Design a protein around this ligand. Structure first.
Ligand code: TYZ
Length: 167
């Protein structure tokens, strides 16, 4: 038993809810919140801008030190940093950005990072301003992630379409 409430069960291990990933993290304080990162960990908009704003920019300060030391992530890759006031840890995962021409086949590699963590609160990778089809992103999630993932879909209209079209 865990602290997640109000989720619809899609599979043995995947759950979904219409919720803002920021408000959900603040309420649950999960072990792991996933950020929809880019390779530079420049948290400007969407999940990353919203998560970073909720940390009063501490996520960005930590991220800049990480990049100064390690260089950029790979598309499909991840790093574990602090969760600040939102979670124990933040798993920053880079899905391909369709609006930059990145290979959508890298979405499966991106979701494979989630398997290193027993439970996660996450957004749909490569959705929203990353330009991928969210229905596709949910299918890859279900077919790739084997650990317990609690998906927060911000858009109510999209949430209803994801549920009603789910195979
Ligand atoms: C404030 C705010 O922008 N929140 C969010 C939450 C989730 C997403 C997303 O999943 O794309 C985008 C934006």
């Amino acid at each position: 038993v865990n602290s997640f409430s109000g989720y619809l069960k899609l599979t043995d291990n995947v759950y979904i809810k219409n919720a803002d990933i920021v408000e959900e993290a603040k309420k649950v304080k999960p072990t792991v919140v996933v950020n929809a990162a880019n390779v530079y960990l420049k948290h400007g908009g969407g999940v990353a801008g919203a998560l970073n704003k909720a940390t009063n920019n501490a996520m960005q300060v930590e991220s800049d030190d990480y990049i100064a030391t390690n260089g950029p992530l790979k598309v499909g890759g991840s790093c574990v940093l602090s969760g600040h006031n939102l979670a124990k840890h933040c798993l920053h995962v880079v899905g391909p950005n369709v609006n930059k021409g990145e290979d959508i086949q890298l979405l499966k590699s991106a979701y494979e990072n989630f398997n290193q963590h027993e439970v996660l609160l996450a957004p749909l990778l490569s959705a929203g301003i990353f330009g991928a089809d969210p229905i596709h992103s949910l299918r890859v999630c279900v077919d790739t992630v084997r650990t317990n993932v609690y998906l927060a879909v911000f858009d109510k209209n999209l949430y209803d379409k994801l549920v009603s079209s789910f195979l």
